[PDB]
Amino acid sequence: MAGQSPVLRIIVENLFYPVTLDVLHQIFSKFGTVLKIITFTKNNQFQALLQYADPVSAQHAKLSLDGQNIYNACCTLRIDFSKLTSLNVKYNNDKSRDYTRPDLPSGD
């Protein structure tokens, strides 16, 4: 029952400025260490997931950035606990980014 799974999923709303991982990382990397990260677009829906090192950093972080901005008053980012209690990160290229093991492939 003790899920204890630090995995938050960010969701940008209202396309405005071009974002990236280096940004989302340095962001969540403040409230806690970011083991891994991922980004994608579901039918034109920017979404970047990540995994913390401890649920404590994920709980506070979530609310610490829940419905907040990335610049001033645009690019609304929505954070929420993953569904699979984890993210699929086994490749290092551009769509994904693992800050735990750099000895991973680039997809192919």
Side-chain angles (χ1 to χ4, degrees):
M1 74 272 307
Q4 183 111 143
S5 247
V7 191
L8 313 177
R9 153 181 56 195
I10 321 149
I11 308 160
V12 173
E13 304 232 72
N14 311 308
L15 224 325
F16 232 79
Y17 276 102
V19 277
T20 143
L21 289 111
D22 297 306
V23 178
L24 100 88
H25 171 229
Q26 253 188 106
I27 276 205
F28 270 88
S29 163
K30 200 206 150 35
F31 294 89
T33 330
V34 192
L35 278 33
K36 306 122 134 162
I37 298 208
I38 317 192
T39 51
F40 49 83
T41 354
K42 179 134 186 204
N43 274 21
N44 209 2
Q45 271 206 30
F46 199 89
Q47 303 200 41
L49 340 167
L50 75 101
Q51 174 137 56
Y52 259 141
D54 269 335
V56 176
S57 342
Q59 288 259 213
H60 298 213
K62 174 221 227 188
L63 313 135
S64 305
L65 299 142
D66 81 271
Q68 264 267 91
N69 308 275
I70 327 201
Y71 297 82
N72 269 343
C74 297
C75 308
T76 315
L77 75 103
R78 299 275 223 197
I79 317 144
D80 305 86
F81 275 111
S82 152
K83 258 222 95 136
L84 327 149
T85 36
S86 356
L87 5 95
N88 40 19
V89 191
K90 353 275 162 81
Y91 327 70
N92 253 339
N93 31 73
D94 332 292
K95 311 231 168 211
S96 335
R97 184 56 134 205
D98 51 62
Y99 301 116
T100 162
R101 287 248 208 86
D103 236 52
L104 293 278
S106 293
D108 201 280

mmCIF file of all heavy atoms in Angstrom, residues 69-87:
data_model
loop_
_atom_site.group_PDB
_atom_site.id
_atom_site.type_symbol
_atom_site.label_atom_id
_atom_site.label_comp_id
_atom_site.label_asym_id
_atom_site.label_seq_id
_atom_site.Cartn_x
_atom_site.Cartn_y
_atom_site.Cartn_z
ATOM 1 N N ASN A 69 3.308 29.354 -13.411
ATOM 2 C CA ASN A 69 3.854 29.724 -14.712
ATOM 3 C C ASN A 69 5.328 29.345 -14.810
ATOM 4 O O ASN A 69 5.930 28.894 -13.836
ATOM 5 C CB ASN A 69 3.684 31.225 -14.953
ATOM 6 C CG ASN A 69 2.256 31.687 -14.735
ATOM 7 O OD1 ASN A 69 1.422 31.609 -15.637
ATOM 8 N ND2 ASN A 69 1.968 32.172 -13.533
ATOM 9 N N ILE A 70 5.903 29.530 -15.993
ATOM 10 C CA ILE A 70 7.307 29.208 -16.219
ATOM 11 C C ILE A 70 8.113 30.462 -16.544
ATOM 12 O O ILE A 70 9.344 30.445 -16.513
ATOM 13 C CB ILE A 70 7.475 28.193 -17.366
ATOM 14 C CG1 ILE A 70 6.290 27.226 -17.397
ATOM 15 C CG2 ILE A 70 8.783 27.433 -17.214
ATOM 16 C CD1 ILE A 70 6.585 25.932 -18.124
ATOM 17 N N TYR A 71 7.411 31.546 -16.856
ATOM 18 C CA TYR A 71 8.061 32.809 -17.187
ATOM 19 C C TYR A 71 7.471 33.954 -16.371
ATOM 20 O O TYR A 71 8.156 34.561 -15.548
ATOM 21 C CB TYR A 71 7.917 33.105 -18.680
ATOM 22 C CG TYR A 71 8.603 32.089 -19.567
ATOM 23 C CD1 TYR A 71 7.984 30.887 -19.885
ATOM 24 C CD2 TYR A 71 9.867 32.334 -20.087
ATOM 25 C CE1 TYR A 71 8.607 29.956 -20.695
ATOM 26 C CE2 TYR A 71 10.496 31.409 -20.899
ATOM 27 C CZ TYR A 71 9.863 30.222 -21.199
ATOM 28 O OH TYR A 71 10.486 29.299 -22.006
ATOM 29 N N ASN A 72 6.195 34.244 -16.604
ATOM 30 C CA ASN A 72 5.511 35.316 -15.891
ATOM 31 C C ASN A 72 4.038 34.980 -15.683
ATOM 32 O O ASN A 72 3.588 34.788 -14.553
ATOM 33 C CB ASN A 72 5.642 36.633 -16.659
ATOM 34 C CG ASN A 72 6.857 37.433 -16.233
ATOM 35 O OD1 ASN A 72 7.435 37.190 -15.175
ATOM 36 N ND2 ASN A 72 7.251 38.395 -17.060
ATOM 37 N N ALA A 73 3.293 34.908 -16.780
ATOM 38 C CA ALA A 73 1.870 34.594 -16.720
ATOM 39 C C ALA A 73 1.422 33.832 -17.960
ATOM 40 O O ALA A 73 0.353 34.094 -18.510
ATOM 41 C CB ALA A 73 1.056 35.869 -16.558
ATOM 42 N N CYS A 74 2.248 32.887 -18.399
ATOM 43 C CA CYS A 74 1.936 32.085 -19.576
ATOM 44 C C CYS A 74 2.624 30.726 -19.506
ATOM 45 O O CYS A 74 3.552 30.528 -18.723
ATOM 46 C CB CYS A 74 2.363 32.822 -20.847
ATOM 47 S SG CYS A 74 1.489 34.380 -21.126
ATOM 48 N N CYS A 75 2.163 29.793 -20.334
ATOM 49 C CA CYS A 75 2.734 28.451 -20.367
ATOM 50 C C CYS A 75 2.318 27.651 -19.135
ATOM 51 O O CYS A 75 3.076 26.818 -18.640
ATOM 52 C CB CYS A 75 4.260 28.524 -20.449
ATOM 53 S SG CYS A 75 4.876 29.572 -21.788
ATOM 54 N N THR A 76 1.109 27.912 -18.648
ATOM 55 C CA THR A 76 0.592 27.216 -17.475
ATOM 56 C C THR A 76 1.045 25.761 -17.457
ATOM 57 O O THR A 76 0.811 25.016 -18.410
ATOM 58 C CB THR A 76 -0.946 27.265 -17.426
ATOM 59 O OG1 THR A 76 -1.405 28.591 -17.715
ATOM 60 C CG2 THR A 76 -1.457 26.834 -16.060
ATOM 61 N N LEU A 77 1.692 25.361 -16.367
ATOM 62 C CA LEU A 77 2.177 23.992 -16.226
ATOM 63 C C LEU A 77 1.373 23.236 -15.174
ATOM 64 O O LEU A 77 1.251 23.681 -14.032
ATOM 65 C CB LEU A 77 3.660 23.991 -15.851
ATOM 66 C CG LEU A 77 3.963 24.373 -14.401
ATOM 67 C CD1 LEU A 77 4.295 23.137 -13.581
ATOM 68 C CD2 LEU A 77 5.104 25.377 -14.343
ATOM 69 N N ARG A 78 0.827 22.090 -15.566
ATOM 70 C CA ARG A 78 0.035 21.270 -14.656
ATOM 71 C C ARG A 78 0.804 20.021 -14.242
ATOM 72 O O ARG A 78 1.210 19.221 -15.086
ATOM 73 C CB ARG A 78 -1.288 20.874 -15.314
ATOM 74 C CG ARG A 78 -2.161 22.061 -15.687
ATOM 75 C CD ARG A 78 -3.007 22.522 -14.512
ATOM 76 N NE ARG A 78 -4.379 22.825 -14.910
ATOM 77 C CZ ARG A 78 -5.219 23.541 -14.171
ATOM 78 N NH1 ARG A 78 -4.827 24.026 -13.000
ATOM 79 N NH2 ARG A 78 -6.450 23.775 -14.602
ATOM 80 N N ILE A 79 1.002 19.859 -12.938
ATOM 81 C CA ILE A 79 1.724 18.707 -12.413
ATOM 82 C C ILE A 79 0.782 17.751 -11.688
ATOM 83 O O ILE A 79 -0.151 18.179 -11.008
ATOM 84 C CB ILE A 79 2.842 19.139 -11.445
ATOM 85 C CG1 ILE A 79 3.596 20.344 -12.008
ATOM 86 C CG2 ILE A 79 3.796 17.982 -11.187
ATOM 87 C CD1 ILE A 79 4.037 21.330 -10.947
ATOM 88 N N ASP A 80 1.032 16.454 -11.839
ATOM 89 C CA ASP A 80 0.206 15.437 -11.198
ATOM 90 C C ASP A 80 0.943 14.102 -11.133
ATOM 91 O O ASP A 80 1.755 13.788 -12.002
ATOM 92 C CB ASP A 80 -1.111 15.268 -11.955
ATOM 93 C CG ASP A 80 -1.858 16.578 -12.117
ATOM 94 O OD1 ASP A 80 -1.566 17.311 -13.085
ATOM 95 O OD2 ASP A 80 -2.733 16.871 -11.274
ATOM 96 N N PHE A 81 0.655 13.322 -10.096
ATOM 97 C CA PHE A 81 1.293 12.022 -9.920
ATOM 98 C C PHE A 81 1.023 11.117 -11.117
ATOM 99 O O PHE A 81 -0.115 10.985 -11.565
ATOM 100 C CB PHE A 81 0.794 11.356 -8.637
ATOM 101 C CG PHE A 81 1.547 11.784 -7.408
ATOM 102 C CD1 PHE A 81 0.932 12.556 -6.436
ATOM 103 C CD2 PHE A 81 2.870 11.414 -7.228
ATOM 104 C CE1 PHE A 81 1.622 12.951 -5.306
ATOM 105 C CE2 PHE A 81 3.565 11.807 -6.100
ATOM 106 C CZ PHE A 81 2.941 12.576 -5.137
ATOM 107 N N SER A 82 2.081 10.495 -11.630
ATOM 108 C CA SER A 82 1.960 9.602 -12.777
ATOM 109 C C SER A 82 0.862 8.570 -12.550
ATOM 110 O O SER A 82 0.317 8.459 -11.451
ATOM 111 C CB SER A 82 3.293 8.899 -13.042
ATOM 112 O OG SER A 82 3.090 7.638 -13.657
ATOM 113 N N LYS A 83 0.537 7.818 -13.598
ATOM 114 C CA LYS A 83 -0.500 6.797 -13.512
ATOM 115 C C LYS A 83 0.099 5.426 -13.218
ATOM 116 O O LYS A 83 -0.456 4.651 -12.437
ATOM 117 C CB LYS A 83 -1.302 6.746 -14.813
ATOM 118 C CG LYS A 83 -2.650 7.445 -14.725
ATOM 119 C CD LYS A 83 -3.738 6.643 -15.422
ATOM 120 C CE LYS A 83 -4.485 5.752 -14.444
ATOM 121 N NZ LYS A 83 -5.958 5.797 -14.663
ATOM 122 N N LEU A 84 1.232 5.130 -13.845
ATOM 123 C CA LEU A 84 1.899 3.848 -13.645
ATOM 124 C C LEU A 84 2.877 3.923 -12.483
ATOM 125 O O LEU A 84 3.751 3.068 -12.334
ATOM 126 C CB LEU A 84 2.631 3.422 -14.917
ATOM 127 C CG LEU A 84 1.966 3.859 -16.223
ATOM 128 C CD1 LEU A 84 3.014 4.101 -17.298
ATOM 129 C CD2 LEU A 84 0.958 2.817 -16.680
ATOM 130 N N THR A 85 2.727 4.956 -11.666
ATOM 131 C CA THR A 85 3.598 5.155 -10.517
ATOM 132 C C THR A 85 5.052 5.196 -10.959
ATOM 133 O O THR A 85 5.968 5.006 -10.158
ATOM 134 C CB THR A 85 3.419 4.043 -9.466
ATOM 135 O OG1 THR A 85 3.177 2.789 -10.115
ATOM 136 C CG2 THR A 85 2.264 4.365 -8.530
ATOM 137 N N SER A 86 5.251 5.445 -12.246
ATOM 138 C CA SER A 86 6.591 5.511 -12.817
ATOM 139 C C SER A 86 6.539 5.922 -14.284
ATOM 140 O O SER A 86 5.486 5.863 -14.919
ATOM 141 C CB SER A 86 7.295 4.161 -12.678
ATOM 142 O OG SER A 86 6.491 3.237 -11.964
ATOM 143 N N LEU A 87 7.683 6.340 -14.816
ATOM 144 C CA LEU A 87 7.770 6.763 -16.208
ATOM 145 C C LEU A 87 8.686 5.836 -17.001
ATOM 146 O O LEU A 87 9.610 5.239 -16.449
ATOM 147 C CB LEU A 87 8.284 8.201 -16.293
ATOM 148 C CG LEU A 87 8.696 8.824 -14.957
ATOM 149 C CD1 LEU A 87 10.190 8.657 -14.729
ATOM 150 C CD2 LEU A 87 8.310 10.295 -14.915
#
